[PDB]
Amino acid sequence: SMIPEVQKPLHEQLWYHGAIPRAEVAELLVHSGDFLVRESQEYVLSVPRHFIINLYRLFPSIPLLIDHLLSTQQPLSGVVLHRAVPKDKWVLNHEDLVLGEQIGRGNFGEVFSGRLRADNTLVAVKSCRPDLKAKFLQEARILKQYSHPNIVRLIGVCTQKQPIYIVMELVQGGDFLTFLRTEGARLRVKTLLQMVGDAAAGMEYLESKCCIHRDLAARNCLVTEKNVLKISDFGMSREEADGVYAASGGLRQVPVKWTAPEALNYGRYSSESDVWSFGILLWETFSLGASPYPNLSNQQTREFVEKGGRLPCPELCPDAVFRLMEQCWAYEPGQRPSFSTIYQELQSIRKRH
């Protein structure tokens, strides 16, 4: 026999979204009468009007209440229920994750290692410590839509409780900058060519998806135990059908020495500005992780670049890789190659080595 749905605890209800932030509820409630329950404990019934809920009212439990309301079609306001809105397939309960030690940090806070309890899969877990707080789930919205060998995979989103997490594949060899600086001296150029080709494949993929990453750098690339490179940190990334993200107004956090002149000074972000950052990533790679413009401040770099200044060819960087960098740093965005062009050229270079 079956336990009735309404007899199940609130925790188990498809229409209970726990720590769902404001902007999501907005996004989730489509038609008149659509509803969910969430925690504010004070539970809240969001039909977008928000009704605050040992018996619950506006019964022994909140599913008992919700069913009564639906069944009877009596009002809460005038507002009446039509259809409970379920969680999407990506929502994971906190208890399905075993949190491990911190492996990094960013603006929202720590990244941790973890495991999935059900099958021991190792994972990375981005946590969020409130306007910026509203931007946190951006990386999840973006990554839900993708699946590519050189892009970090989304596994799930823990929005049922605080603190909120975004759960991703763990790429166990760590960031590519540390990798270059720690293993680079034993690395063959052919391996380096493969790894920057991985990065180009990932970026070509992002451009096909109308995604503009905005923080491409060795520090935001990750290396598998087999030296496959995956692009990570999609926190600043934006999706634009028409291909340009226009910075919205207000202070911005800018990785100056990886940022194209037009993105920096006019706030025009595009796959073409991403190509500039790729140019810099190529430089980081074939320098075995040197810091770019090492004797210039950020301000001095902006001036040097505006005057036609560019990074020097790293020693023993193959000539065709440096020509490719140079092209990536063309001043006019229109003059830079596509990621398609870059990936093909890198594969061609690699094949010849």
């Binding site: 202070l251 911005r252 956090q253 800018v254 990785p255 100056v256 020495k257 990886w258 920096l264 950020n298």
Partner: peptide
């Protein structure tokens, strides 16, 4: 690396 601008 990052500048608030």
């Amino acid at each position: 690396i990052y500048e608030s601008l």
